[PDB]
Design a protein around this ligand. Structure first.
Ligand SMILES: C[C@H](NC(=O)CCc1nc2ccccc2c(=O)[nH]1)c1ccccn1
Length: 354
């Protein structure tokens, strides 16, 4: 007996979002862009065990890169058996530098979130027994356990967000704003309230691959054991959209290019400012609640405004980037804002940009 498929409750923009972030073609494209062999690693075959084994292989490479152990070649080969790569059916190359090691760790962190999205979609037994099912897009939305509310252009914060995007995005080829959703992942509310005493809150950009958007909506921005970069093992944000936009892996759809970007509220508290890379950081120095790798520029602070989110003032930059003489010799062209506790960020908005 045929189950009834109930009509979709979602508006068109939301249906498109949900289609995009769970799209098998998107996920496979992402795996291709990371040099993975999708024929040998289909989406349905991806497992938590394999990803675990991949990290163990990288852990061994990291120890060798830092005594008669296996060579980097041998240790690479193991990694490529565990995580099949496609390089024109030539031999994949050896992971013999800290840069390439972090690149592979980052690839696996993406792949882990792809596997999360597949595991999220497994059909439950409650679903097999009920006689009516939600529309596939309603089902996928409900799986996120995340409220998304589409904003119209007269919403109080809409202009402020658009101005942030426009003023701090690329000057020549700015991303074009298509939609904004307010994001309310509950489960986030309470840990974030923990930092209510922490003044210095700012709304900051976080760009990602489209393949990790579902994972973020389900679980927030995360720090994992192999997370890394120029400012160590934290969650990275930018005050300049153009900086975060560099991490947006968009996807060709029709004649346009679709990308998604988050705005998070970050409780920065007492800021420690640095002007040189430190990939070894795992927390701010004692007494500090965040690390800001200060750029040569910063959105002009005289133009900052504020939005009231859950009764707290949150700074939102509105200015074009201006030079900061004190940091003119920084190793950072643009600032990177780091937190080292997941609880210091609350997702607030999701933007679709073309
Ligand atoms: C490795 C990848 N990281 C990201 O997607 C964050 C990308 C990012 N990096 C930044 C660095 C400096 C300033 C801004 C950004 C940013 O907006 N996104 C990831 C994916 C899935 C789980 C954990 N990490």
């Amino acid at each position: 007996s045929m189950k009834r498929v109930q009509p979709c409750s979602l508006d068109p923009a939301t249906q498109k979002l949900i289609t995009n972030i769970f799209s098998k073609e998107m996920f496979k494209n992402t795996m291709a862009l990371m040099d993975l062999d999708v024929k040998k690693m289909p989406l349905g075959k991806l497992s938590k065990q394999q990803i675990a084994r991949g990290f163990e292989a990288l852990e061994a490479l990291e120890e060798a890169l830092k005594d008669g152990g296996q060579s980097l070649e041998e240790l690479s080969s193991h990694f490529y058996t565990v995580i099949p790569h496609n390089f024109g059916h030539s031999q994949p190359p050896p992971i013999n530098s800290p840069e390439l090691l972090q690149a592979k760790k980052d690839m696996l962190l993406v792949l882990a979130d792809i596997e999360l999205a597949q595991a999220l979609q497994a059909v439950s037994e409650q679903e097999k027994t009920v006689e009516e099912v939600p529309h596939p897009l309603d089902r996928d939305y409900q799986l996120l356990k995340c409220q998304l509310q589409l904003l119209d252009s007269g919403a109080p914060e809409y202009k402020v967000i658009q101005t942030y995007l426009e003023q701090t995005g690329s000057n020549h080829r700015c991303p074009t704003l298509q939609h904004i959703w307010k994001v309310n992942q509950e489960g986030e509310e309470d840990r974030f309230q923990a930092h209510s005493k922490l003044g210095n809150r700012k709304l900051l950009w976080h760009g990602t691959n489209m393949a990790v958007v579902a994972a973020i909506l389900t679980s927030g921005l995360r720090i994992m054991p192999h997370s890394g970069g120029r400012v160590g093992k934290g969650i990275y944000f930018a005050s300049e959209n153009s900086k975060s936009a560099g991490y947006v892996i968009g996807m060709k759809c029709g004649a346009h290019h679709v990308g998604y970007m988050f705005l998070g509220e970050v409780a920065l508290g007492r800021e420690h400012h640095i002007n040189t890379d430190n990939p070894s950081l795992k927390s701010p120095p004692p007494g500090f609640d965040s690390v800001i790798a200060r750029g040569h520029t910063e959105p002009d602070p005289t133009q900052d405004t504020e939005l009231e989110l859950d009764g707290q003032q949150v700074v939102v930059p509105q200015g074009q980037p201006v030079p900061c003489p004190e940091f003119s010799s920084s190793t950072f062209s643009q600032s990177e804002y780091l937190i080292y506790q997941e609880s210091q960020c609350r997702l607030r908005y999701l933007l679709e940009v073309h």
